[PDB]
């Protein structure tokens, strides 16, 4: 089922919480801010929970555990493989 | 990778748990029915043993002890913590 507006506001709150927690705290942590910002953009563009690569619905379990997830698992593979070229 | 005979055996275990919980049945017991159904779906979607959160392979021991495991332990931790927000 498509996410409600109340669910999305919670993801936005979670994402801003993570974005703020990294200010007090590298190569690995800069990549994370880019993912968090992109997830926040997708909330503004009304595409949160939709895979940037395939347009498929990102499973709610994945978003619940990883609120900055902007791709499906299969698409994140393709993305990471692309970074290697 | 799991054989088809192993997956059919997990499917048999999972359907038996689902049936044993209908005669028996709480808040904890509803969470279990959702997990069992999801594990059964992953068998139909050919994703059993693959973590719903990370796509990592769920350890074979974990599946043997917990046939309704749909996430790695670390991913279930992240998932359970996410449900608490709000």
């Amino acid at each position: 089922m498509p996410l409600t507006d109340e669910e999305i506001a919670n993801f936005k709150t979670r994402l801003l919480e993570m974005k703020a927690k990294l200010s007090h705290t590298t190569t690995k942590e800069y990549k994370l801010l880019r993912q968090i910002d992109r997830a926040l953009e997708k909330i503004e563009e009304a595409s949160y929970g939709i895979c940037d690569v395939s347009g498929e619905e990102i499973p709610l379990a994945r978003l619940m555990a990883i609120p900055y997830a902007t791709m499906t698992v299969k698409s994140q593979e393709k993305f990471e493989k692309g970074l290697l070229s």
Side-chain angles (χ1 to χ4, degrees), chain A residues 2-5 7-20 22-23 26 31-33 35-73 75-85:
Chain A
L3 308 176
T4 72
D5 298 357
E7 287 172 309
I8 293 168
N10 200 350
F11 283 122
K12 188 185 187 185
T13 299
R14 297 182 60 190
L15 289 168
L16 295 170
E17 263 157 11
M18 304 189 44
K19 191 181 179 183
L22 263 61
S23 77
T26 55
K31 179 191 184 66
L32 185 52
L33 287 176
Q35 254 168 304
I36 285 165
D37 281 329
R38 177 53 191 162
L40 286 169
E41 295 173 16
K42 294 169 65 49
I43 292 182
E44 303 302 304
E45 308 172 341
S47 68
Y48 186 83
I50 304 298
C51 179
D52 275 358
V53 173
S54 67
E56 282 161 13
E57 278 180 23
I58 311 179
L60 178 49
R62 182 165 159 89
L63 296 168
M64 188 65 53
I66 313 186
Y68 54 86
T70 62
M71 299 167 270
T72 63
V73 174
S75 293
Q76 200 183 336
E77 266 179 53
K78 290 177 93 176
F79 175 82
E80 298 285 350
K81 177 168 162 185
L83 291 176
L84 295 192
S85 307

